[PDB]
Amino acid sequence: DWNFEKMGIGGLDKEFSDIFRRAFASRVFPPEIVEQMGCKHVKGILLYGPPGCGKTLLARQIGKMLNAREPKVVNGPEILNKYVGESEANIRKLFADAEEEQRRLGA
Amino acid sequence: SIINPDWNFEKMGIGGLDKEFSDIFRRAFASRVFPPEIVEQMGCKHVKGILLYGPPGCGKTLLARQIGKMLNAREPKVVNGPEILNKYVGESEANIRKLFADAEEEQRRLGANSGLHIIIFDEIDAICKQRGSTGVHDTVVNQLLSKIDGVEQLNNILVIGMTNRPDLIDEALLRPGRLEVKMEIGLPDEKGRLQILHIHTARMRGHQLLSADVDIKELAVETKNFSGAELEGLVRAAQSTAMNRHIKASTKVEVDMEKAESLQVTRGDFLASLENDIKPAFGTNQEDYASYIMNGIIKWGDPVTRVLDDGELLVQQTKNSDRTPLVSVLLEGPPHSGKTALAAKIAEESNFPFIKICSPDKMIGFSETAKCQAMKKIFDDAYKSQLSCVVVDDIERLLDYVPIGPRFSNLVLQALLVLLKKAPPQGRKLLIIGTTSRKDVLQEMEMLNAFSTTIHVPNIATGEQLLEALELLGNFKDKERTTIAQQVKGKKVWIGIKKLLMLIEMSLQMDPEYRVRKFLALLREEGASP
Amino acid sequence: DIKELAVETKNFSGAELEGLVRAAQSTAMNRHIKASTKVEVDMEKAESLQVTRGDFLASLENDIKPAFGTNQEDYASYIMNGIIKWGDPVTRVLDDGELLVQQTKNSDRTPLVSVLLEGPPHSGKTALAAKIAEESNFPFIKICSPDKMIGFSETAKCQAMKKIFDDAYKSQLSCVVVDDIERLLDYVPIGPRFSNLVLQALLVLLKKAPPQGRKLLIIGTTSRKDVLQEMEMLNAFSTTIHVPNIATGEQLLEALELLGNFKDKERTTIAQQVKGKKVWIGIKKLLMLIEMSLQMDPEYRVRKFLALLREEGASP
Amino acid sequence: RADQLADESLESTRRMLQLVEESK
Amino acid sequence: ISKQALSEIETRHSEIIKLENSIRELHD
Amino acid sequence: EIETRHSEIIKLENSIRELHD
Ligand SMILES: Nc1ncnc2c1ncn2[C@@H]1O[C@H](COP(=O)(O)OP(=O)(O)OP(=O)(O)O)[C@@H](O)[C@H]1O
Ligand SMILES: Nc1ncnc2c1ncn2[C@@H]1O[C@H](COP(=O)(O)OP(=O)(O)OP(=O)(O)O)[C@@H](O)[C@H]1O
Ligand SMILES: Nc1ncnc2c1ncn2[C@@H]1O[C@H](COP(=O)(O)OP(=O)(O)O)[C@@H](O)[C@H]1O
Ligand SMILES: Nc1ncnc2c1ncn2[C@@H]1O[C@H](COP(=O)(O)OP(=O)(O)O)[C@@H](O)[C@H]1O
């Protein structure tokens, strides 16, 4: 049933249950039956709303509770350059760690 | 052989693409299996280029990789499409050249014995635009065309390109001598949907984890204008729903996983997911109707029945005709008469697989070019179905009419007029419905010639009708009803339904004593005649 | 035979005949191979390999598409319901087109001739131009339509005009079809308003002769001649033809008989009601009315048809 | 070109240190 | 589209070849 | 890197001088 109380985010409690129900059922259930199902996990979710409504805090809590690695924060307007397109360079550095992790540890 | 020793079509897992694979094999692979002696006696030259164009949601990439492995390919090189770009001058050309180094080396070292090299480009349209300064996009096409069929001669290469828009590619790249064959991948039919469902349900059927209640023919029938990605998402969503059903009863309470191991996806999961999880791009969407028909369709007079019958006749004519693939109809009437709602209802009652509505509301502040782009995009998308219905609402607002002047945007008018008389590709049907409120000015602009017919929606014009509408609405009591009837029957009234509802709401705010009096006073005030 | 192939292929580039030959050979050899899921070669059938005319004809019809030659789909997308001789004028128009093409083909001192086709809307003049063009047998024929220029700016339109005319300039004989001139100019009775640049480009483009003795033919279609005459544009055109509507009830009965519709006593009763009056309608509206009238039960179809014909048979 | 610079420079430091210790 | 490049040098006086000859001679 | 090269040059100078002695 998870837990969301006294650890910073306090206003949003039903949202965790809703989002988890919609998204995080594959990663909670024992992996054996999952590989038997032969299914893939979701590859992203969107959040939107008025500014300064505690979205980053929610993301950091989710990252902490999934035991994932350190999130790699980034902003939109920062990644833009006048050299006939050097954005692709900016874009590509971000997925190295996943690339090497997959290459080495496999599945 | 040049192909792998073991391969069979059924294993590839691709479902629906049958004639396309056969034709590609016959064209681009005939000469590579026929014994070398007769081939050198032929002296013919293999094809060295292929293009694929499909709409988003067909995963031709699957076909790309699957063809690559179907052959004894070595290591198909891949480029996303925006790469090979750099700020420094003269770098992309070098990168392009680097691609062919192994091929040229083998061609020089060996001859008539070197293996095949395959290159998979993604989204050729990204860079290979028409060559007019086009910046770096012009110097790259020349090098590419310089490489292919160059001063020198290569005979151990093959190039595959994928793009969604085939009419924005440089024509010079499209010759009888390079990238010659082009093939279209479109949406599947019922049989393809069934095959895809079988492919994606084989594993579940294997472990006896699929309930016996589920039927696949029914699913194939229901899902219309769906694509492989959408269908796989549907299956995944059904699995996730069946899963969540068990995350609150067995593992929630940490009780015996025996009931958790009795997990079986059933028809209920599919029929719950098919309605609230997946939104097809080329299929109906049952939220616009409820958004437009805010208060249903109450029958207050005969004209409604006539209008509905006429719309039904139009729909049947479109469906059943052969020598008239395009049909148009225009709805007109005084303001606040309920045009949009009636158009939405008649559109809903068509049962066509594709339907769309376009309103000024979703374009506020735009410029004329953007409006034109939106309209052409909608019509282009519609062109790709076997049956479709589009609604263009408040035509006067799209043109930005204002009586002073007058002033308006001529460009959008020309675009609309031209579009109204363009047939779709062979063997496909269409139906256009328009809404307006100023038929005269529409006539002076000569646009009524395009339309095929018109329908008239009148207003309420009799006390009996008003009393019947009030009774059907469910307001006021017997004595109030009698006082109103004994008052209004003498004269005539002229009002649209929507304003009537507004007025009733206005009147329903005073005390019980004065409600009828205020209603009558306002009704009289907001009265007029033709 | 090689002579038939050489004659039948026109305006082909050197890179296209080779592709044709390769495609024919590919089809021929693919004939022998019989393998769908598991690759397999019938070496027995490979002992005797030969290529017949069928390979060449199939490749020509299906595979190869010339870039500077004429293409058959264009003629398919415009004459949708054929041509039916419902009256004398059709033969007159076709013969006049024949005479014009003859003059341009076999004359010097006049390598450029232009004709104008005008008439009321829905009269079916666009298809007739395509028919005229199809009987010239010229190596290069092209049609330019506003159908492919939705949302374009003035510059784009004029550059399209440039590219088409420049391409046409590269053959010995050429015909070009300009359709719905008014729509190209962006006309609207209010104001009036239109694009001057396109008008200037067209006016100047009806007098430039092809270089060094090459012929050319231009066929333009429109529906509002008065506006054109107000634009001094009728001076550019070398002549003019007229396409009328149907006028007489006998013509209507002839058309109905030819179409394959209401017959027997039906026809008779219809004849009893139209013969004693004048009619005025274009064929395209006649087809639309006929289609629309066929959705009722088989007891009022004639009634609905007659009521419509009355409502729309205006200005007899 | 810095790659061969680093390579030759590592080679130089290794050889010089080793060779000095042997002489010493 | 734009941009040009440049290059530079540095004080290096390696002469590792001569130092290698010398040190080898020292070893023998 | 360059700092390591400075350390190397210092060490080499020292070693050469004491070799001389
Ligand atoms: N039988 C009915 N006929 C028409 N409208 C009805 C009927 N029953 C309910 N309505 C309500 O009438 C309203 C129809 O408004 P609608 O927008 O179609 O009118 P309109 O005259 O086209 O207005 P506008 O010019 O503002 O677009 C909706 O609230 C619809 O719920
Ligand atoms: N004898 C005929 N003459 C002309 N058209 C005919 C004849 N018989 C059938 N048709 C059909 O009539 C239709 C002609 O419509 P068309 O678009 O050419 O009309 P139009 O009045 O020239 O208008 P537009 O300028 O919009 O093209 C075509 O479908 C053609 O197949
Ligand atoms: N529900 C909440 N409970 C406690 N603090 C909140 C909540 N929502 C926002 N805040 C506070 O508001 C500030 C801005 O929140 P932030 O995460 O930046 O929201 P956003 O991502 O929308 O900008 C943070 O310092 C955070 O502590
Ligand atoms: N016909 C199909 N059958 C099975 N899966 C499909 C099909 N079409 C698309 N997909 C799925 O969609 C995913 C992404 O497809 P993608 O290549 O992005 O589509 P497109 O090539 O149209 O852009 C793939 O992982 C693939 O599994």
Numbering used by the authors:
A (entry chain A): 212 to 318
B (entry chain B): 207 to 338, 343 to 740
C (entry chain C): 425 to 740
D (entry chain I): 17 to 40
E (entry chain G): 187 to 214
F (entry chain H): 194 to 214
What does the paper say about this structure?
Supercomplexes of NSF, α-SNAP, and either a syntaxin tetramer or one of two binary complexes of syntaxin—SNAP-25 reveal atomic details of SNARE processing and show how sequential ATP hydrolysis drives disassembly.
Presumably, disassembly of the binary 2:1 complex had occurred and was followed by reassembly of the 2:2 binary complex before vitrification. Critically, the pore loop approaches the substrate-engaged state found in the non-hydrolyzing classes; together, this suggests a trajectory of protomer A dissociation, nucleotide release and rebinding, and, finally, SNARE substrate rebinding. Furthermore, in classes with ordered syntaxin substrate, the unstructured region of syntaxin N-terminal to the H3 domain is engaged by the D1 pore loops around eight residues further into the primary sequence under hydrolyzing conditions. Of the five 22bin20S classes with the 2:2 binary SNARE complex, all are found with syntaxin in the D1 pore, while two are observed with the N-terminus of the SNAP-25 SN1 domain in the pore. This configuration locates two independent N-terminal portions of the SNAP-25 linker bearing cysteine sidechains often palmitoylated in vivo near the membrane. The 2:2 configuration is only found following NSF-mediated disassembly of the 2:1 configuration.
